[PDB]
From a paper:
[name] functions in the early secretory pathway by regulating the transport of secretory vesicles between the endoplasmic reticulum (ER) and ER–Golgi intermediate compartments (ERGICs). To perform its role in clustering vesicles, [name] self-assembles into homomeric cup-shaped octamers via interactions encoded in its N-terminal Phox and Bem1p (PB1) domain and a subsequent coiled-coil motif. Within this region is an LCD (residues 237–327) rich in proline, tyrosine, and glutamine that functions to further polymerize these octamers into larger assemblies and phase-separate. Mutations in the [name] LCD are associated with degenerative neurological disorders such as Charcot–Marie–Tooth disease type 2 (CMT2) and hereditary motor and sensory neuropathy with proximal dominant involvement (HMSN-P).
Numbering used by the authors:
A (entry chain I), B (entry chain M), C (entry chain Q), D (entry chain U), E (entry chain Y), F (entry chain 2), ...: 262 to 290
P (entry chain 3), Q (entry chain Z), R (entry chain V), S (entry chain R), T (entry chain N), U (entry chain J), ...: 265 to 290
Write the structure that this text describes.
């Protein structure tokens, strides 16, 4: 029972911003 | 029973923004 | 029983926006 | 029993928008 | 029993919009 | 028993719109 | 029962921003 | 029962920012 | 029951910033 | 029951900054 | 029941700064 | 019940700074 | 019940500074 | 019940400084 | 109940400084 | 005024269709 | 005025469709 | 005015669809 | 004015979908 | 005006979805 | 005006999703 | 005006998700 | 104006998520 | 104007998450 | 204007997270 | 204007986290 | 203007974290 | 303008953390 | 303008941390 | 302008930490 869990989360509020891209890599096997 | 879980989430509220693209890669096998 | 799960989610409210494209790649086999 | 699941979701409310295109690729076999 | 599932969903409410096109590609075999 | 399932859905309500075209490609064989 | 958990989280409020990209790598197997 | 837990968190408020990228690597096996 | 826990946290408020990147490595096995 | 705990924390307020990167290494096994 | 605890903390306020990087190493086993 | 505790702390206020890096090593086993 | 405790602390205020690095080593076992 | 306690502390105020590095070694066992 | 206590303290104020390094060694066992 | 949208999957069955209704009252 | 959207998965069953309703009252 | 969105997974079952409703009252 | 979003996982079951509702009152 | 977002995991069950709601009152 | 975000893990259960709500009142 | 974010772990259970809410009043 | 962030770990349970809320009043 | 951040560990339990809130009043 | 950050460890329990809040009043 | 940071260790308990708050008034 | 940092160790308990607050008034 | 840093060790207890606060008034 | 740093060891207790505060008034 | 550094050892107790404060007035 293999269950790898990867959470990549970006959020912002009240006159904010995020510029960077999201590039995650998950390798099983 | 192999269940890899990848969560890529972007959200924003109240005069906010996100610019970066979402490019995730999942490899099984 | 192989069940890879990939979640790519963008949302925004109250005068917000998202500019980046969504380009996910899932490889099984 | 192979069941790969890919969820690409964009939504917005209350004077919001999404500009990026949706281009997901799923490879089985 | 091979059942790949790809969900591409865009929706918006209350003075919102989505501009990007939907171009998903699914390859089996 | 091969059953690939591709869902491309656009909807909007309450003074909303969607501009992008829908161009999905499904390849079996 | 192997369950590796990786949390990558960026958020900001009240006239703030984040510039760096998110590039995490998870290797199981 | 192996459960490695890695938390990478960046946040900022009230006219602040973070510039560095997030590049964590987790190796199990 | 092996549970290694690594916490990498950067935050700042009231006209502050952080420049350095986050590059943690966790090795189990 | 092995539980190694490593805390790497940088924060600053009121016209302050941190420049150095965060590169911690945890080895179990 | 082995619980090694390592705390690496940098903070500053009121027109201050920290330049040095954080590179801690924890070896169990 | 082995609990080694190592505290490495740098802080400064009111027009101060710290230049040296933090490189602690903890060996158990 | 073995609990070795090592405290390495540098701080400064009102136009002060610390230059030396922090390199403590703790050996148990 | 073995509890060795080592305190290494450097501080300075009002136009002062400390140059020497901190390199303490604690051996138990 | 063995509790060896070693205090190494350097401080200075009002246009002062300390140059020498701190290298204490504590051996129990 | 009552509006009911119900999707019910009985035992040993599979339902794949998404559920996305629009309900306007008043 | 009551609006009910209910997705119910019985025992030994699988439901894959997302749940995304839009409800406007008044 | 009451709006209910309920996702219920019975015993020995799997639900995979996300829950993302939009509710506007007044 | 009451808005309820409820995700309930019964015994020996798995729910994987995220919960991300948007609620506007007044 | 009351807004309730509730995620409830019953006994011997697993919930993996994140909880990230947006609530605007007035 | 009351906003409630509640994550409840019953006995012998595991919840993995993060809790990150945004609440705007007035 | 009351905003409540509550994370509750019952007996013999594990909660792993971080708690990071943003609350704006007035 | 009252804002409550509460993390409660019941008996024989483990909570691992950090607590890092941002609260703005006035 | 009252802001409460409370971390409570009941008997025979372990809490590992750090407590680092940011509170702005006026 | 009152800001309360409270970390409470009940009997026969362990709390490991650091306490590092930032409080700005006026 | 009152700011309270309180760390309380009940009987037969262990608290390991450091206490390092930053408080700005006026 | 009152700022209180209090570390309290009850009977038969151990507190190991250092106390190092920064307080700026006016 | 009053600033209070208090470390209190109750009966049959041990406190090991150093006390090193920085207080700036005016 | 009053600044108080107080270390108090109750009966049958041990305090090991040094006391080294920095106080700037005017 | 009053600055108080007080170390108080109650009956049948041991205090080992040195007392070394720095006080700047005017």
């Amino acid at each position: 029972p293999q269950q790898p869990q990867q959470y990549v989360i970006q959020y912002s509020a009240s006159y904010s911003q995020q510029t960077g891209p999201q590039q995650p890599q998950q390798f099983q096997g």
